[PDB]
Structure formats: C-alpha cells, structure tokens
Design a protein around this ligand. Sequence first.
Ligand SMILES: *[C@@H]1O[C@H](CO)[C@@H](O[C@@H]2O[C@H](CO)[C@@H](O)[C@H](O)[C@H]2NC(C)=O)[C@H](O)[C@H]1NC(C)=O
Length: 49
Amino acid sequence: NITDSLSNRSLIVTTILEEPYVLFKKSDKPLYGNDRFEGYCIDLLRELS
Ligand SMILES: *[C@@H]1O[C@H](CO)[C@@H](O[C@@H]2O[C@H](CO)[C@@H](O)[C@H](O)[C@H]2NC(C)=O)[C@H](O)[C@H]1NC(C)=O
C-alpha cells in the first residue's frame, strides 16, 4: 500500500515560467496560489498529490 504516507506534510515547490510546462490560467479573475498555474507538470503535481 503506497498511499498517503506523506499526508500531513506541507511542501514548497518552485517553478520557472516555461510555456509548455506551466501557464497562467486563462481567466479574468485574479486567482490565488496553485490555481494561478496550469500545464503539464502542474498536472504531474496534481497526480502526485
Ligand atoms: C497524520 O496522518 C495520520 C495517518 O496518515 C493520521 O492518523 C490517524 O489519527 C487518528 C487520531 O489520532 C488515529 O486514531 C488513527 O489511528 C491514525 N491513523 C493511523 C493509520 O494510525 C493523523 O490524523 C494525521 N494528523 C492530523 C490530520 O493532524
């Protein structure tokens, strides 16, 4: 069972604005935090979470 062993941990993740991997979300509303970014490795981070 390789489930949520790191469940209570909180991590800080740094990225650089590379267009095919991260992107600002195409919304007029000012988003906050992890809603501000989308892309390939953002989906990788979502799947790893
Ligand atoms: C941290 O994570 C653990 C497991 O990932 C959570 O565990 C349970 O906590 C309750 C309350 O003390 C226990 O009765 C259970 O036995 C625990 N589970 C296991 C498998 O031991 C814990 O709640 C988390 N801490 C938080 C959310 O503050």
